[PDB]
């Protein structure tokens, strides 16, 4: 069944300097293959932690991830004007991969990945996304998508590793297909059959791999293309 993790507080409000934790649960045991993200105000997404406790290049060691079995915290001390934004947690131990639903923090008083194809469809129609890479050897790299939705979760839509083995959440299964293109370096989702509940914000993303045989980070994130299904 499906590791949800949940994020007891949705907002934290604190001020400069301070020490802040933020929660992070798993319903079942993930053998520390907790990944954390942040996303900054203006929508932009980074890794910030993998395997529960291993930063993610620079970021500073005002940031400590903890945890094991199914508790999970990251502590931001310090707090400096670019720590105000949501952070996500991640579990990579099973699929489908799963987020919490993120905890806002408030303050009190190169690899380039580029989406493209969104539009406004009715449903049961049809789109092609495109996410052109550059500045790496995009053909040995895992790439997923994940979306966002308009209540700001985040959730894993599908993964495609560089030879091209595929990897569904089911709830899109067999209406979305991933592909890639290893010359053009460029990643697909062919959504076909579209449901209103697709409407999102969909995001490609460049795994690392962290431990074999699958746990993997989202080590960088493209800003999104825009998908609106509307009767
Ligand atoms: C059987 O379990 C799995 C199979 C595949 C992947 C997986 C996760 C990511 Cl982020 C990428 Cl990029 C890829 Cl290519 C595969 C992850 C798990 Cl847990
Ligand atoms: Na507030």
């Known amino acids: 069944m499906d590791i949800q993790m949940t994020q007891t507080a949705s907002s934290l409000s604190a001020s400069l300097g301070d020490r802040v934790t933020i929660s992070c649960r798993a319903s079942?045991?993930?053998?520390?293959?907790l990944n954390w993200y942040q996303q900054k105000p203006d929508g932009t997404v980074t890794l910030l932690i993998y395997?529960?406790?291993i930063l993610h290049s620079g970021v500073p060691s005002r940031f400590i991830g903890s945890g094991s079995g199914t508790d999970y915290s990251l502590t931001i001390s310090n707090l400096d004007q670019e720590d105000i934004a949501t952070y996500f947690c991640?579990?990579?131990?099973?699929?489908?991969?799963?987020f919490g639903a993120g905890t806002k923090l408030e303050l009190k008083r190169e690899v380039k990945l580029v989406e493209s194809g969104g539009g406004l469809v009715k449903p049961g129609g049809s789109l092609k996304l495109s996410c052109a890479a550059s500045?790496?050897?995009?053909?040995?790299?895992?790439m997923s998508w994940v979306r966002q939705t308009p209540e700001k979760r985040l959730e894993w839509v599908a993964s495609?590793?560089?030879?091209?083995?595929?990897y569904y959440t089911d709830i899109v299964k067999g209406r979305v297909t991933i592909s890639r293109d290893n010359d053009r370096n460029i990643l697909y989702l062919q959504m076909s059959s579209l449901r209103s509940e697709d409407t999102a914000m969909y995001h490609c993303?460049?795994?690392?791999?962290?431990?074999?045989?699958?746990?993997?980070?989202?080590?960088?994130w493209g800003q999104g293309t825009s998908v609106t299904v509307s009767s």
């Open positions: 991640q579990q990579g131990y099973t699929l489908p991969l799963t």
């Open positions: 993303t460049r795994g690392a791999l962290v431990r074999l045989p699958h746990y993997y980070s989202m080590d960088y």
């Open positions: 495609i590793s560089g030879g091209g083995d595929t």
């Open positions: 079942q045991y993930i053998n520390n293959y």
């Open positions: 500045g790496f050897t995009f053909s040995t790299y895992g």
């Open positions: 395997y529960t406790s």
